[PDB]
CSV table of C-alpha atoms in Angstrom, one decimal:
chain,number,residue,atom,x,y,z
A,16,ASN,CA,-17.3,26.0,10.0
A,17,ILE,CA,-15.4,22.9,10.9
A,18,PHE,CA,-17.3,19.8,9.9
A,19,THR,CA,-18.6,19.1,6.4
A,20,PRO,CA,-22.4,18.4,6.0
A,21,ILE,CA,-23.0,14.6,5.7
A,22,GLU,CA,-24.5,14.7,2.2
A,23,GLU,CA,-21.5,16.6,0.8
A,24,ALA,CA,-19.1,14.3,2.6
A,25,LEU,CA,-20.9,11.2,1.2
A,26,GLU,CA,-20.4,12.5,-2.4
A,27,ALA,CA,-16.7,12.9,-1.7
A,28,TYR,CA,-16.6,9.4,-0.3
A,29,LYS,CA,-18.5,8.1,-3.3
A,30,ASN,CA,-15.9,9.7,-5.5
A,31,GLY,CA,-13.0,7.9,-3.7
A,32,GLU,CA,-11.9,10.6,-1.4
A,33,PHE,CA,-10.8,10.2,2.2
A,34,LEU,CA,-12.7,11.7,5.1
A,35,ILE,CA,-11.2,12.6,8.4
A,36,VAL,CA,-13.5,11.2,11.1
A,37,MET,CA,-13.8,12.2,14.7
A,38,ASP,CA,-16.1,10.8,17.4
A,39,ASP,CA,-17.9,14.1,17.9
A,40,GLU,CA,-17.1,17.8,18.1
A,41,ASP,CA,-14.7,17.7,21.1
A,42,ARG,CA,-11.3,19.3,20.5
A,43,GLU,CA,-9.5,16.4,22.2
A,44,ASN,CA,-10.8,13.8,19.8
A,45,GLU,CA,-8.2,12.0,17.7
A,46,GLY,CA,-8.9,11.7,13.9
A,47,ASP,CA,-8.8,8.8,11.6
A,48,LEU,CA,-8.7,8.7,7.8
A,49,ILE,CA,-11.4,6.6,6.2
A,50,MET,CA,-12.3,5.8,2.6
A,51,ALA,CA,-14.2,3.2,0.5
A,52,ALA,CA,-12.3,-0.1,0.5
A,53,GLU,CA,-13.2,-0.8,-3.1
A,54,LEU,CA,-11.7,2.5,-4.2
A,55,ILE,CA,-8.4,2.6,-2.4
A,56,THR,CA,-5.5,2.7,-5.0
A,57,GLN,CA,-1.8,2.1,-4.5
A,58,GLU,CA,-1.2,5.8,-4.3
A,59,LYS,CA,-4.1,6.3,-1.8
A,60,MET,CA,-2.8,3.5,0.4
A,61,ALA,CA,0.7,5.0,0.2
A,62,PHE,CA,-0.9,8.3,1.4
A,63,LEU,CA,-2.8,6.6,4.2
A,64,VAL,CA,0.3,4.8,5.5
A,65,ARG,CA,2.5,7.9,5.1
A,66,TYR,CA,0.4,10.0,7.5
A,67,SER,CA,-0.9,7.3,9.9
A,68,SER,CA,0.1,4.6,12.4
A,69,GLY,CA,0.3,2.2,9.5
A,70,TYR,CA,-1.8,-0.4,11.4
A,71,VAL,CA,-4.2,-0.3,8.4
A,72,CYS,CA,-7.6,-1.9,9.1
A,73,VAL,CA,-10.5,-2.9,6.8
A,74,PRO,CA,-13.9,-2.7,8.4
A,75,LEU,CA,-16.4,-5.2,6.9
A,76,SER,CA,-19.8,-6.3,8.0
A,77,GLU,CA,-20.0,-9.4,10.1
A,78,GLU,CA,-22.0,-11.0,7.3
A,79,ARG,CA,-19.3,-10.3,4.7
A,80,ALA,CA,-16.4,-11.4,7.0
A,81,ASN,CA,-18.3,-14.7,7.5
A,82,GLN,CA,-18.7,-15.2,3.7
A,83,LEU,CA,-15.0,-14.7,3.2
A,84,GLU,CA,-14.3,-17.0,6.2
A,85,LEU,CA,-12.5,-14.3,8.3
A,86,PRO,CA,-13.4,-15.3,11.8
A,87,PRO,CA,-12.5,-13.3,14.9
A,88,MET,CA,-8.8,-13.5,15.8
A,89,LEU,CA,-9.8,-14.7,19.3
A,90,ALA,CA,-12.4,-17.5,19.3
A,91,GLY,CA,-11.5,-1.3,18.7
A,92,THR,CA,-10.6,-4.9,18.9
A,93,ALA,CA,-13.1,-7.3,17.2
A,94,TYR,CA,-10.2,-8.1,14.8
A,95,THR,CA,-10.4,-11.1,12.5
A,96,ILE,CA,-7.4,-13.2,11.4
A,97,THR,CA,-5.2,-11.1,9.1
A,98,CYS,CA,-5.0,-11.7,5.4
A,99,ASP,CA,-3.5,-11.0,2.0
A,100,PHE,CA,-5.1,-11.4,-1.4
A,101,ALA,CA,-3.2,-14.2,-3.0
A,102,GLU,CA,-3.1,-13.4,-6.7
A,103,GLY,CA,-1.3,-10.2,-7.5
A,104,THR,CA,0.7,-9.8,-4.2
A,105,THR,CA,4.2,-10.7,-3.1
A,106,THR,CA,5.3,-9.3,0.2
A,107,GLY,CA,1.8,-8.3,1.1
A,108,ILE,CA,2.9,-5.2,3.0
A,109,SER,CA,3.6,-3.0,0.0
A,110,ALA,CA,1.2,-0.2,-0.7
A,111,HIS,CA,0.2,-1.9,-3.9
A,112,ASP,CA,-0.5,-5.2,-2.1
A,113,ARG,CA,-2.4,-3.8,0.8
A,114,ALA,CA,-4.5,-1.7,-1.5
A,115,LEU,CA,-5.2,-4.8,-3.7
A,116,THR,CA,-6.1,-6.9,-0.6
A,117,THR,CA,-8.4,-4.1,0.6
A,118,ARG,CA,-10.3,-3.8,-2.7
A,119,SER,CA,-10.5,-7.5,-2.9
A,120,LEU,CA,-12.2,-7.7,0.5
A,121,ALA,CA,-14.9,-5.4,-0.8
A,122,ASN,CA,-15.3,-7.2,-4.2
A,123,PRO,CA,-18.5,-9.2,-4.1
A,124,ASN,CA,-16.9,-11.8,-6.4
A,125,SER,CA,-14.1,-12.6,-4.0
A,126,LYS,CA,-14.0,-16.0,-2.4
A,127,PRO,CA,-12.6,-17.4,0.9
A,128,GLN,CA,-9.9,-19.3,-1.0
A,129,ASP,CA,-8.7,-16.2,-2.7
A,130,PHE,CA,-7.0,-15.0,0.5
A,131,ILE,CA,-3.9,-16.1,2.4
A,132,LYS,CA,-4.1,-16.1,6.2
A,133,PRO,CA,-2.4,-14.7,8.1
A,134,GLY,CA,-1.6,-11.6,6.1
A,135,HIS,CA,-0.8,-7.9,6.3
A,136,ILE,CA,-4.3,-6.4,6.3
A,137,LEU,CA,-6.4,-6.3,9.5
A,138,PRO,CA,-10.1,-6.9,8.7
A,139,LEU,CA,-12.5,-5.6,11.3
A,140,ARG,CA,-16.1,-6.9,12.0
A,141,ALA,CA,-18.7,-4.2,12.1
A,142,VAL,CA,-21.8,-5.2,14.2
A,143,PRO,CA,-25.2,-5.4,12.6
A,144,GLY,CA,-27.0,-2.1,12.9
A,145,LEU,CA,-23.7,-0.3,12.4
A,146,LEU,CA,-23.7,3.1,14.1
A,147,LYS,CA,-27.2,2.6,15.5
A,148,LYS,CA,-25.8,-0.3,17.5
A,149,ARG,CA,-22.2,0.7,18.2
A,150,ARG,CA,-20.6,4.1,17.6
A,151,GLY,CA,-17.2,2.7,16.6
A,152,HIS,CA,-15.0,3.8,13.7
A,153,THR,CA,-15.4,0.3,12.3
A,154,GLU,CA,-19.2,0.7,12.2
A,155,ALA,CA,-18.7,4.3,10.8
A,156,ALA,CA,-16.6,3.0,7.9
A,157,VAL,CA,-19.2,0.4,6.9
A,158,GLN,CA,-22.0,2.9,7.4
A,159,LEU,CA,-20.3,5.5,5.1
A,160,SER,CA,-19.8,2.9,2.4
A,161,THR,CA,-23.5,1.8,2.7
A,162,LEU,CA,-24.8,5.4,2.6
A,163,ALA,CA,-22.6,6.0,-0.5
A,164,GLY,CA,-24.2,3.0,-2.3
A,165,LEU,CA,-20.9,1.1,-2.2
A,166,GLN,CA,-19.9,-2.4,-0.9
A,167,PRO,CA,-20.2,-2.6,2.9
A,168,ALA,CA,-16.4,-2.2,3.3
A,169,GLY,CA,-14.1,0.6,4.3
A,170,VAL,CA,-10.4,1.1,5.2
A,171,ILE,CA,-9.1,3.2,8.1
A,172,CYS,CA,-6.1,4.2,10.1
A,173,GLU,CA,-5.1,6.8,12.8
A,174,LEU,CA,-3.6,10.1,11.7
A,175,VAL,CA,-0.2,10.8,13.4
A,176,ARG,CA,1.9,13.9,13.6
A,177,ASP,CA,5.2,13.9,11.8
A,178,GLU,CA,6.9,16.0,14.5
A,179,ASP,CA,6.5,13.5,17.4
A,180,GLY,CA,4.3,10.6,16.3
A,181,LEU,CA,1.4,11.8,18.5
A,182,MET,CA,-2.1,11.2,17.2
A,183,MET,CA,-3.7,14.2,15.6
A,184,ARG,CA,-6.2,16.0,17.7
A,185,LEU,CA,-9.0,18.1,16.2
A,186,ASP,CA,-6.9,21.2,15.6
A,187,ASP,CA,-4.2,19.2,13.8
A,188,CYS,CA,-6.9,17.4,11.8
A,189,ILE,CA,-8.4,20.7,10.7
A,190,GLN,CA,-4.9,21.7,9.5
A,191,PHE,CA,-4.4,18.4,7.8
A,192,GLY,CA,-7.8,18.6,6.1
A,193,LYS,CA,-7.1,22.1,4.7
A,194,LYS,CA,-3.5,21.2,3.5
A,195,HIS,CA,-4.7,18.1,1.7
A,196,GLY,CA,-8.2,19.1,0.8
A,197,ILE,CA,-9.9,16.4,2.9
A,198,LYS,CA,-13.4,17.0,4.4
A,199,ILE,CA,-13.9,16.3,8.1
A,200,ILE,CA,-17.0,14.8,9.8
A,201,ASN,CA,-17.8,13.3,13.2
A,202,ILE,CA,-19.8,10.2,14.2
A,203,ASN,CA,-22.3,12.1,16.3
A,204,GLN,CA,-23.0,14.2,13.2
A,205,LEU,CA,-23.5,11.0,11.2
A,206,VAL,CA,-25.7,9.3,13.7
A,207,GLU,CA,-28.0,12.3,13.7
A,208,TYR,CA,-28.2,12.1,10.0
A,209,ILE,CA,-29.2,8.4,9.7
A,210,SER,CA,-31.6,8.8,12.6
A,211,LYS,CA,-33.3,12.0,11.3
B,19,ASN,CA,32.2,0.8,2.4
B,20,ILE,CA,28.5,0.0,2.8
B,21,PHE,CA,28.0,-2.6,5.5
B,22,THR,CA,29.1,-2.1,9.1
B,23,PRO,CA,31.2,-4.9,10.6
B,24,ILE,CA,29.0,-7.1,12.8
B,25,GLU,CA,31.0,-6.4,16.0
B,26,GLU,CA,30.6,-2.6,15.6
B,27,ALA,CA,26.9,-3.1,14.7
B,28,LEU,CA,26.3,-5.2,17.8
B,29,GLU,CA,27.7,-2.5,20.1
B,30,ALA,CA,25.3,0.1,18.4
B,31,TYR,CA,22.4,-2.4,18.9
B,32,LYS,CA,23.4,-3.0,22.5
B,33,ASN,CA,23.3,0.8,23.0
B,34,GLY,CA,19.7,1.0,21.8
B,35,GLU,CA,20.4,2.1,18.2
B,36,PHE,CA,18.5,0.8,15.2
B,37,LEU,CA,20.2,-1.2,12.6
B,38,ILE,CA,19.1,-1.3,8.9
B,39,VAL,CA,19.0,-5.0,7.9
B,40,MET,CA,19.1,-6.4,4.3
B,41,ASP,CA,19.0,-10.1,3.3
B,42,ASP,CA,22.4,-9.9,1.6
B,43,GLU,CA,24.5,-7.5,-0.5
B,44,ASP,CA,22.1,-7.3,-3.5
B,45,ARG,CA,21.1,-3.8,-4.4
B,46,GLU,CA,17.5,-4.9,-5.0
B,47,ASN,CA,16.9,-6.0,-1.4
B,48,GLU,CA,14.5,-4.0,0.7
B,49,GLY,CA,15.6,-2.8,4.1
B,50,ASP,CA,14.1,-3.2,7.5
B,51,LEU,CA,14.8,-1.2,10.7
B,52,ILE,CA,15.5,-3.5,13.7
B,53,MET,CA,16.4,-2.7,17.3
B,54,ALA,CA,16.3,-4.4,20.7
B,55,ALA,CA,12.7,-4.7,21.9
B,56,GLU,CA,13.6,-3.9,25.6
B,57,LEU,CA,15.2,-0.6,24.5
B,58,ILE,CA,12.5,0.9,22.3
B,59,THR,CA,11.3,4.2,23.7
B,60,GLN,CA,8.3,6.3,22.8
B,61,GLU,CA,10.6,8.5,20.6
B,62,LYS,CA,12.2,5.6,18.9
B,63,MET,CA,8.8,3.9,18.2
B,64,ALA,CA,7.5,7.2,16.8
B,65,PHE,CA,10.7,7.2,14.6
B,66,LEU,CA,10.1,3.6,13.5
B,67,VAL,CA,6.5,4.3,12.6
B,68,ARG,CA,7.3,7.5,10.9
B,69,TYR,CA,9.6,6.0,8.3
B,70,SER,CA,8.1,2.5,8.0
B,71,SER,CA,5.0,0.6,6.9
B,72,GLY,CA,3.7,0.9,10.5
B,73,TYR,CA,3.0,-2.8,10.6
B,74,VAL,CA,5.4,-3.0,13.6
B,75,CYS,CA,6.3,-6.6,14.6
B,76,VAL,CA,8.1,-8.0,17.7
B,77,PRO,CA,10.2,-11.0,17.0
B,78,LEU,CA,10.4,-13.4,20.0
B,79,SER,CA,11.8,-16.9,20.4
B,80,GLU,CA,9.2,-19.7,20.2
B,81,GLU,CA,10.1,-20.5,23.8
B,82,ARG,CA,9.3,-16.9,25.0
B,83,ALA,CA,6.1,-16.7,23.0
B,84,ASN,CA,4.9,-20.0,24.6
B,85,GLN,CA,5.7,-18.6,28.0
B,86,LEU,CA,3.7,-15.5,27.3
B,87,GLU,CA,0.9,-17.6,25.9
B,88,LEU,CA,1.1,-16.0,22.5
B,89,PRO,CA,0.2,-18.9,20.1
B,90,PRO,CA,0.4,-18.7,16.3
B,91,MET,CA,-2.4,-16.7,14.9
B,92,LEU,CA,-3.5,-19.7,12.8
B,93,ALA,CA,-2.9,-23.4,13.1
B,94,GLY,CA,6.1,-18.2,6.3
B,95,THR,CA,6.0,-15.3,8.7
B,96,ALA,CA,5.0,-16.8,12.0
B,97,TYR,CA,2.5,-14.3,13.4
B,98,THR,CA,1.1,-14.9,16.9
B,99,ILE,CA,-2.2,-13.5,18.1
B,100,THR,CA,-1.7,-9.7,18.5
B,101,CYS,CA,-1.4,-8.0,21.9
B,102,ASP,CA,-1.2,-4.9,24.1
B,103,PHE,CA,0.4,-4.6,27.5
B,104,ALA,CA,-2.5,-3.8,29.8
B,105,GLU,CA,-1.1,-1.5,32.5
B,106,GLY,CA,0.0,1.8,31.1
B,107,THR,CA,-1.7,1.7,27.7
B,108,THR,CA,-5.0,3.2,26.5
B,109,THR,CA,-5.5,3.1,22.7
B,110,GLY,CA,-2.7,0.6,22.4
B,111,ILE,CA,-1.8,2.1,19.0
B,112,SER,CA,0.1,5.2,20.2
B,113,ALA,CA,3.8,5.3,19.9
B,114,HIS,CA,4.0,5.3,23.7
B,115,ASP,CA,1.7,2.2,24.0
B,116,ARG,CA,3.4,0.2,21.2
B,117,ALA,CA,6.8,0.9,22.7
B,118,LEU,CA,5.6,-0.1,26.2
B,119,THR,CA,4.1,-3.3,24.9
B,120,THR,CA,7.3,-4.1,23.0
B,121,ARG,CA,9.5,-3.5,26.0
B,122,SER,CA,7.1,-5.6,28.0
B,123,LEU,CA,7.3,-8.5,25.6
B,124,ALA,CA,11.1,-8.5,26.2
B,125,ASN,CA,10.9,-8.1,30.0
B,126,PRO,CA,11.5,-11.5,31.6
B,127,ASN,CA,9.2,-10.5,34.5
B,128,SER,CA,6.2,-10.2,32.2
B,129,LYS,CA,3.4,-12.7,32.6
B,130,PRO,CA,0.7,-14.0,30.2
B,131,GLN,CA,-2.1,-12.2,32.0
B,132,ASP,CA,-0.2,-8.9,31.7
B,133,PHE,CA,-1.3,-8.6,28.0
B,134,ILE,CA,-4.6,-8.0,26.3
B,135,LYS,CA,-5.3,-10.0,23.1
B,136,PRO,CA,-5.9,-9.1,20.4
B,137,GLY,CA,-3.9,-5.9,20.4
B,138,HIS,CA,-1.8,-3.5,18.3
B,139,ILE,CA,1.6,-5.2,18.4
B,140,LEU,CA,2.4,-8.2,16.1
B,141,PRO,CA,4.7,-10.7,17.9
B,142,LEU,CA,6.6,-13.1,15.6
B,143,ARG,CA,7.8,-16.5,16.6
B,144,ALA,CA,11.5,-17.1,15.7
B,145,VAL,CA,12.5,-20.7,15.1
B,146,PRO,CA,14.9,-22.5,17.4
B,147,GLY,CA,18.4,-22.2,15.9
B,148,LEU,CA,17.6,-18.7,14.7
B,149,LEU,CA,19.6,-17.8,11.5
B,150,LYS,CA,21.3,-21.2,11.4
B,151,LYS,CA,17.8,-22.7,10.8
B,152,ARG,CA,15.9,-19.9,9.0
B,153,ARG,CA,17.3,-16.7,7.5
B,154,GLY,CA,14.2,-14.6,8.2
B,155,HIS,CA,14.3,-11.1,9.5
B,156,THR,CA,12.4,-12.5,12.5
B,157,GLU,CA,15.3,-14.8,13.3
B,158,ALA,CA,17.7,-12.0,12.6
B,159,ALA,CA,16.1,-9.7,15.2
B,160,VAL,CA,16.3,-12.4,17.9
B,161,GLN,CA,19.8,-13.3,16.9
B,162,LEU,CA,21.0,-9.7,17.1
B,163,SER,CA,19.5,-9.3,20.6
B,164,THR,CA,21.1,-12.6,21.7
B,165,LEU,CA,24.5,-11.7,20.3
B,166,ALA,CA,24.2,-8.3,22.1
B,167,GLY,CA,23.6,-10.1,25.5
B,168,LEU,CA,20.0,-8.8,25.6
B,169,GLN,CA,16.6,-10.5,26.0
B,170,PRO,CA,15.8,-12.7,22.9
B,171,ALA,CA,13.4,-10.1,21.6
B,172,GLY,CA,13.5,-7.5,18.9
B,173,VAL,CA,11.2,-5.1,17.0
B,174,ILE,CA,11.1,-4.5,13.3
B,175,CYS,CA,9.4,-2.7,10.4
B,176,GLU,CA,9.9,-2.1,6.7
B,177,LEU,CA,11.4,1.1,5.5
B,178,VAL,CA,9.2,3.1,3.1
B,179,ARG,CA,9.9,6.1,0.8
B,180,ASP,CA,8.0,9.3,1.7
B,181,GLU,CA,7.7,10.2,-2.0
B,182,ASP,CA,5.7,7.2,-3.2
B,183,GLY,CA,5.4,4.7,-0.3
B,184,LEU,CA,7.6,2.2,-2.1
B,185,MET,CA,9.9,0.1,0.1
B,186,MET,CA,13.5,1.3,0.3
B,187,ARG,CA,16.0,-0.7,-1.7
B,188,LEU,CA,19.7,-0.7,-0.9
B,189,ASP,CA,20.5,2.7,-2.4
B,190,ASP,CA,17.7,4.4,-0.4
B,191,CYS,CA,18.7,2.5,2.7
B,192,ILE,CA,22.3,3.8,2.5
B,193,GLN,CA,21.0,7.4,2.1
B,194,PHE,CA,18.6,6.8,5.0
B,195,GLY,CA,21.5,5.4,7.1
B,196,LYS,CA,23.7,8.3,6.5
B,197,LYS,CA,21.0,10.9,7.0
B,198,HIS,CA,20.1,9.5,10.4
B,199,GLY,CA,23.4,8.0,11.5
B,200,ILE,CA,22.2,4.4,11.4
B,201,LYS,CA,24.5,1.5,10.6
B,202,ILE,CA,23.6,-1.1,7.9
B,203,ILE,CA,24.2,-4.9,7.9
B,204,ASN,CA,22.9,-7.9,6.0
B,205,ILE,CA,21.9,-11.4,7.0
B,206,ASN,CA,24.4,-13.3,4.9
B,207,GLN,CA,27.1,-11.2,6.6
B,208,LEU,CA,25.6,-12.1,10.0
B,209,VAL,CA,25.4,-15.8,9.3
B,210,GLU,CA,29.0,-15.8,8.4
B,211,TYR,CA,29.9,-14.2,11.7
B,212,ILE,CA,28.0,-16.8,13.8
B,213,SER,CA,29.4,-19.6,11.6
B,214,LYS,CA,33.0,-21.0,11.3
């Protein structure tokens, strides 16, 4: 009565909707908004920023980050050097620009030279094996995209309360989901699905 | 009747108030919130994140950044490797943690090993000579703190509209300033003060 069945959630994700993702069923878990990187529009990015910490990250597989030449920032942490898609952006931080950069990181035709580093988007490297190897939200994002038949790339950010800036716990996430019509799932629930 | 005189603005800044900073008087400029890094509280950081892009940066002098061992992210906005103050933080992204990290970057007693890298705060390296060398908002932040007799460190973020996520131009900044009782100034105005 709280979490959406994985198959229904994947269809929403495939259709470009956000999903509120918790670690498991615990009431104290803090929720993050996650959606397909290739489908995030200017409006959807504006929505993500409006209700989150604004530290917008783009989970990518290690293989993809390597192809785009996005090495770890230091030669859930595991950050790579930041970046902005060159053509089509100006300040890089605008909703339009961050959305464009995010979609570009997912686009198979994108090339390393297409990006400016540093930038305003924080790509994240998901470990091989995804959720079966590490139950991080980074792995969850790439796992969702993969299950949805999309490019192995997602975009995420922490939900925050407008009243005091505190991260949204389960109760507040449930409220947020009903108000905005966003389905909620948890990683434990997702791991069980992919495992059996 | 729009921009506050620099001396009055400095007193507000000195008292821990935010300042809305524009490049010059042009109505098309986008405004950023800037305040002293050492005075940013949990509440003020929550406020900053609530009305901004959330890509919160912490301008520091190149000399201070070197002392804290925060080298440029890559070897233009001079981003350093990101960081989180270790003791007292958990997720690093919370308003409490980001404010603590920001105050710590300003604290002259802080040491290189006190921070974890990468992190959730984006330090920026202000060029020597500040606004007399480069008119960036980074230099402006450090210049404001210096003129206020505070540590050469500031914290900034871009104001964004709640309706569509577009950055606030002058008109919206004036409305924002009056609604929250925040003074507005511009760089050209500041350079003139420090000159002559």
